[PDB]
């Protein structure tokens, strides 16, 4: 039975993946700004729907090895949808429908992450949890960098605004999703890994935000970027502390503290440089 | 001696211009003639680093640091060479040292955390 | 843990609320009938999605005080989406895309109400039930 | 000697490439080894001129000129260094000398008049 | 000796950067100190070739080749210098030799045929 459900999932995932690729090609084969906008909206819409359909069936996969496959399917669809949108938007530039591209990536990243977390919330193996965490972090990281790069290839305007907020929102949600799944870990080895996953993501989100305000030396964004950076660091740290509190072994408690101090210092330096600009 | 000064200058010029191979050859001369020039040990290590010659970069960075323990950049680059070779424990220690000397080195801090993750 | 889930909800709700406001401003800042139609459709689409995401997480809030917060978040999003649509549609008039405005409000009201009822169906305190009822009635009346 | 030739060449190359600091260091060597190379005295003065080191540029230009009084460019640059320091009387005299050697130096002539105005 | 190594390096750097005149001066030094460096004889010949100094390029290429007969590039450039001077018989012989060493040198082959046509 699990095979039946999983097979329906693989089928839907393959179909969607292919449709996404076809839409992306059409947008590049075509010569108009609208072709790009339509593929971006349709890729995102289809990817969203595919993910939701998968979650709907995936919830019946009592056995973890199938759940793992469902998570992978979601993550793969999300990655392809994001990359397809990125490519079209990046090729297009000219500040036209670029906000849609940023929003679409962020929305897909959120959808996929929460869907993964939702399925992941129903299992018990530690390795599985780690895989779910990894998938979330993977998606968040890719989405952040795709968004970052798009803003650099548009130059200032409002695209960097969208990017700063999108990154902060995504990173925050990803962190909390990780913290939530991570709260079910049984050993320090795994809790520490979750902490690090958070810390790495937080650092990357901060660097992307930092770079966007910094490379445009723009006071509007210096202020927003600073607030976003502080926000990320505070939440990342609190998430870490929640998890850290369940660690009973000093080697890991100390590691977590070092990580927290590192995040805080990184955030502070990014802020200081932006203030000086 | 004048020989050391010329060797140093040629090394430095080639180094700045990206001809690291040339710089290496010149620095070996500068150091053979004057082993205490920490700057040549350092630039030599960088010239090798730039070529992917990480073991050499490590040896020379270590020498530069023995002569000048406060060279935060050398500590940083030392950590980077260890990092590139997969020795995260060492990269971690050296990133921390570079940071103690220079707390503003964001990249060292970021790399410290990344090394910590890779070491596990 | 409930805080984690609730925090994700507050985060999503704030984001959506803000996006709705931005779309509404764009529609008034712009000079075309389509700007209004686009904001109406996007406000409704985003509000719908936000509500659904919230329900999806809110269902894990075993403790009622958090559920109450989730309900409030849904209701607030629904209200802002409705008011934003109303304002744009009312300012616009001229019988253009007005049917969309009506449908959008009704659809949002339905979505929000049923979502609230769905979450509300899982708790036991009488006051909470009354609050859920009040929220539904509030949304229906405004719509 | 070969040492002087290498010093000279390194100085000249660095000079041409804009690394005037390097050129200065190399020329000091070239001159220490061979004090009569007017070209090094001259390029040394220019390397300093380029860095805003006008007092040094003046000293070295004077040496180059003692060795070679017909170096119109050096007279010109000498005048420019004096001009930059506000010593217009000296700039005026040197612009005139550069012009006697090279009447086609329009810039020296223009600068002569400007110096005359600034001196009053 | 260190002097030869510095001379060589300076020559090579100047050569790469296009300052062939400088490279010539440096290579003369490198060879005076160490006459067996075929690479300097070769690069010296090229530095002259680049300036249109074909007779010099021929002399130096010949020396480089006596030290290293397998330098196909030197044979090629030798042939080119003869070609440029109108001595097609010599250019022909050297293009053929460069080709025996390196059959993939299309330009030498094309130039061989062109030289054959010019010689008649």
Residue numbers in the entry:
A (entry chain B): 1 to 277
B (entry chain A), D (entry chain A), E (entry chain A): 1 to 120
C (entry chain B): 1 to 143
Quote the passages of the study that discuss this structure, keeping the authors' original sentences.
The tetrahedral nanoparticles, T33_dn2 and T33_dn10, assembled at a high yield (~80–100%) under all the conditions tested. We used cryo-electron microscopy (cryo-EM) to obtain more detailed information on the structures of the BG505-SOSIP-T33_dn10 and -I53_dn5 nanoparticles and the Env trimers they display. The data were therefore computationally segmented to reconstruct the nanoparticle core and the displayed trimer as two independent but flexibly linked entities (sub-particles). The final resolutions of the reconstructed maps were 4.25 Å and 12.50 Å for T33_dn10 and I53_dn5, respectively. The T33_dn10 core design model from Rosetta Design was relaxed into the EM map using a combination of Rosetta relaxed refinement and manual refinement in Coot. There are only small, local structural differences between the Rosetta-predicted, unliganded and BG505-SOSIP-bearing models of the T33_dn10 nanoparticle core. The Cα RMSD between the experimentally determined and predicted models is 1.43 Å (on the level of the asymmetric unit), demonstrating that the presence of four displayed BG505-SOSIP trimers did not cause any major structural rearrangements within the nanoparticle core.
Protein constructs based on soluble ectodomains of HIV glycoprotein (Env) trimers are the basis of many current HIV vaccine platforms. Here, we describe and comprehensively evaluate a library of de novo designed protein nanoparticles of different geometries for their ability to present trimeric Env antigens.
